[PDB]
Design a protein around this nucleic acid. Structure first.
Lengths: 18, 55, 70, 629
RNA sequence: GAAACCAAAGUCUUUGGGUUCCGGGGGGAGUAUGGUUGCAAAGCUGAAACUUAAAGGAAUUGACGGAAGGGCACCACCAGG
RNA sequence: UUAAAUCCUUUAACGAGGAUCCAUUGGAGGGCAAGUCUGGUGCCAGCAGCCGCGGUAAUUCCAGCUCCAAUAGCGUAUAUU
């Protein structure tokens, strides 16, 4: 509770594949 | 990794130049040079002071 | 890459912030450092330095005397 | 190689290869087979009368085309075997000049004999230099209308005055028709400067515009744009962007007869449904006693000018102190700086690029490998041939959905161009563009200010973010646009492929666009992290050996405990960390590697990721002619 | 003579007795290639690209010895309290 | 003056107070002449032909002032002596 966070990895942009 | 370009030139504080009177150019400048080193000579026991010697 | 023979060389851009004036696929005028084919000083394997970028000099761009086209 | 005859044979073979390449390149432009040679003309000074030079320059055969205000014509000659299209443009008019100088093959600058150029000419010439110069020819008007003793001195002074912008270039004077013929012969044979953005897409200048409205009430109809293809092979399935009016799809391409042949109705293609690119700029899918205390319970008009001067003071306090933001004594520091974290080193400390993304990145597109996709698209552009309309053909384009007012603009005098895009270019992404400040303007510009962008045939208002142009993974946010720094503007925009020139203008007053920055387009990705830094300052007021008591950095007790894992640095170069808070106020114990001076000041850096605003709109107001104050 | 040293390494800026071979900062490298000889091993002749601010030769003192000898101390030991 | 002109030369009239009719190009650790000045940076940006400078007092970087050299000229690259 000082310098700790959860920060879930959500809502990424859609990527054009190669 | 690292590799900044123009960090300090663009990061330094910008100070404008002062406005001073124009310097004599040509023979007048050589005259002013001559009567500074050989005419109004200052007596010094060791001559430890240069022309730009500050503090 | 030089035009007249096609050789690939590396040229050191002298001053700070002058690299931002060079862009890829730009015409550059390049001269040596001064030791006639020898790597000079701190830079290993470089014989050359950039003189002009897009038909204006690096010194005029550095001093803000001219603008470069593209 | 040795054997002198064989060495000379090698030299002759290289000579023949270079000659063949040069002669192949020079056959494409302004002739029997190729498109007409477009020459745009700008008079740099206000004293120059352009119609006199135009009646001097028109005479082969002329075809006087007309518009609402501008008067451009079509030149044809078999004596030089050359075909020209001469157009006029006036400096200060940002719209017309910057919109149709990006299609001209040759620019002709006109200079008054006495002075070099006007201030409006200097502004327009700076914009033309920053947008990408085609082959330019300098020409003067009033030299021969002077006495000879004044003529020679006037030419000397003019050649002195030119050298600051054009370093070494010959000046061709125009007073007689013979001089005009010599100038035409000069423009026919020139070393062409090839602009890359024109060459990698399929651009078109509208020689004639017709409108067939589907319904008058909807104000929507089909455009019939007839002109000459000049870029790559024009493909119907690709999208079409009109520079001032957005990107949209086509319907049909037909080929009428050429109205201007050098030596004197049928449809080519209609669009298929499946193979046509889909116009989608964004993503479709979104127990205690009564009285005891806790201490014992533990035992149990002028407003704009004022804002402008406030912006000046903010910029002055931003340069002499980089990123120090004062801790508010009303709000707790852990609340106002809730989203800020401490990094051990700005280069090496880890940070997940996909850690905490906003809902705006759920609306944009990313590239898995931008360099590989760009290389494949460019290889498919150059090395492959498509069955569309070739360059040099006079074609008519039926474009399905346009507004009416565009046609009205073509009847006002404003030029119309339209270019066919590359694939995956109508989609939206986050452009990163490297720009430096033009010395012409000194207005302070904050980070998220509203500025107008000319990014490679596109024009859009946007609110960028300014960052250091480094090579690391993290890039610090720059709160102001520094004059000598080269910075990175990061903003939401439709994605386009480099190389592309970038211009940044600001709406000053009365519709006057002020050029504030220029540069080019760097690699495009939303993964380029922009980090805002906030520096909290505290005063070490009790100094002992290797440890000290510091105040004024915080004001609570738990605020110090919140920012305990963040290390403190020092303006005199010391490094340390917080040991323990002592006061109920913001007093704390800090250990350091050395002994602090009494003149010293402790400070800590906090870091957060900032994302640009979504203020994208393709509409931009038409500029008034530029003038100095 | 840079010196250790040398009656030669002397008769050398007061520089010419005759004559043969051979060196030109350290590496690459006595390497590659070519020629030649040899059964072979290899011998003889022999580069370049590139790399480098040095490499060496003589002497002069002696931190440090995991070098050796002596001497001293119950803030070291022995016998003890 | 000259084929006819231009320039030079000769002469009418106007044409000089320092904010002007305003002189630059390189450098200031040593070689090599001239700052242990002040601000910023902090083995970063960079400087540096060579030795070397910069990792919190930078005589060497980026700037202000001052100083030095040549001077309507001064740098840099290259060939050559």
């Amino acid at each position: 509770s000082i310098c700790s966070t959860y920060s879930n990895l959500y809502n990424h942009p859609q990527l054009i594949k190669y | 990794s690292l590799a900044r370009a123009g960090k300090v030139r663009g990061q330094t504080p910008k100070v404008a130049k002062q406005e001073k009177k124009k310097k004599k150019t040509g023979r007048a400048k050589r005259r002013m040079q001559y009567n500074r080193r050989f005419v109004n000579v200052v007596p010094t026991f060791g001559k430890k002071k240069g022309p730009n010697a500050n503090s | 890459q030089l035009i007249k023979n096609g050789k690939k060389i590396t040229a050191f851009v002298p001053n700070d912030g002058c690299l931002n004036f060079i862009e890829e696929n730009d015409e550059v005028l390049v001269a040596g450092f001064g030791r006639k084919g020898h790597a000079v000083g701190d830079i290993p394997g470089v014989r050359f330095k950039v003189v002009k970028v897009a038909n204006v000099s690096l010194l005029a761009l550095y001093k803000g005397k001219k603008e470069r086209p593209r | 190689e040795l054997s002198r005859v064989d060495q000379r044979h090698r030299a002759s073979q290289l000579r023949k290869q270079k000659k063949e390449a040069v002669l192949a390149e020079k056959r494409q432009l302004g002739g029997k087979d190729g498109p007409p040679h477009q020459v745009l003309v700008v008079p740099l000074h206000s004293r120059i009368s352009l119609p006199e030079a135009m009646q001097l320059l028109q005479d082969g055969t002329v075809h006087l085309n007309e518009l609402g205000n501008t008067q451009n014509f079509m030149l044809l000659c078999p004596r030089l075997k050359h075909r020209w299209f001469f157009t006029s443009a006036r400096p200060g008019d940002l719209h017309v000049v910057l919109d149709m100088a990006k299609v001209a093959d040759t620019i002709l600058f006109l200079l008054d004999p006495l002075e070099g150029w006007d201030s409006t000419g200097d502004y327009c010439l700076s914009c033309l230099f920053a947008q990408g110069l085609p082959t330019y020819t300098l020409a003067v008007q009033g030299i021969s209308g002077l006495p000879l003793k004044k003529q020679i001195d006037t030419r000397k002074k003019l050649s002195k005055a030119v050298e600051k912008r054009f370093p070494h270039d010959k000046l061709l004077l125009l007073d007689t028709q013979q001089e005009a013929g010599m100038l035409l012969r000069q423009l026919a044979n020139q070393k062409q400067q090839h602009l890359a953005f024109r060459d990698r897409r399929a651009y078109l200048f509208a020689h004639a515009v017709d409108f067939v409205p589907s319904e008058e009430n909807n104000l929507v109809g089909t455009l019939k744009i007839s002109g000459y293809v000049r870029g790559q092979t024009l493909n119907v399935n690709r999208l079409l962007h009109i520079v001032g009016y957005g990107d949209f799809q086509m319907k049909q391409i037909d080929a009428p007869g050429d109205p201007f042949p050098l030596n004197p109705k049928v449809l080519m293609k209609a669009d298929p449904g499946r193979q046509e690119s889909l116009q989608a700029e964004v993503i479709p899918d979104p127990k205690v006693p009564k009285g005891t205390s806790s201490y014992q319970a533990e035992w149990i008009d002028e407003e704009a000018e004022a804002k402008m001067l406030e912006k000046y003071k903010q910029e002055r306090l931003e340069e002499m102190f980089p990123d120090e933001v004062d801790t508010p004594r009303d709000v707790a520091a852990r609340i106002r700086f809730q989203k800020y974290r401490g990094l051990k080193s700005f280069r090496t400390s880890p940070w997940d690029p996909k850690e905490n993304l906003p809902q705006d990145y759920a609306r944009i597109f990313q590239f898995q490998n931008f360099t590989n996709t760009r290389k494949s698209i460019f290889k498919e552009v150059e090395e492959k041939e498509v069955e569309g309309a070739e360059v040099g053909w006079y074609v008519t384009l039926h474009v399905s959905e346009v507004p009416v007012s565009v046609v009205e603009c073509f009847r006002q005098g404003t030029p119309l161009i339209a270019f066919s895009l590359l694939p995956h270019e109508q989609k939206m992404s986050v452009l990163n563009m490297v720009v430096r400040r033009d010395p012409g303007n000194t207005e302070p510009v904050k980070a998220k200010e509203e500025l107008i962008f000319h990014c490679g045939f596109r024009r859009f208002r946007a609110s960028p973010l300014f960052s250091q142009h480094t090579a690391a993974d993290k890039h610090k946010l720059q709160r102001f646009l520094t004059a000598d720094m080269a910075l990175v503007a990061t903003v939401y925009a439709p994605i386009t492929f480099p190389p592309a020139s970038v211009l940044l203008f600001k709406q000053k007053s009365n519709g006057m666009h002020s050029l504030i920055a220029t540069g080019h387009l760097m690699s495009v990705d939303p993964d380029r992290m922009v980090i805002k830094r906030v520096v909290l300052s505290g005063h070490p007021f009790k100094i002992f050996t290797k440890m000290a008591v510091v105040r004024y950095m915080f004001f609570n007790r738990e605020d110090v405990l919140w920012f305990k894992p963040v290390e403190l640095r020092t303006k005199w170069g010391r490094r340390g960390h917080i040991k323990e808070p002592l006061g109920t106020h913001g007093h704390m114990k800090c250990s350091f590697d050395g002994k602090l001076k009494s003149q010293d000041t402790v400070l800590m850096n906090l870091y957060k990721r900032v994302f640009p605003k979504w203020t994208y709109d393709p509409y931009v107001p038409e500029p008034v002619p530029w003038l100095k104050s």
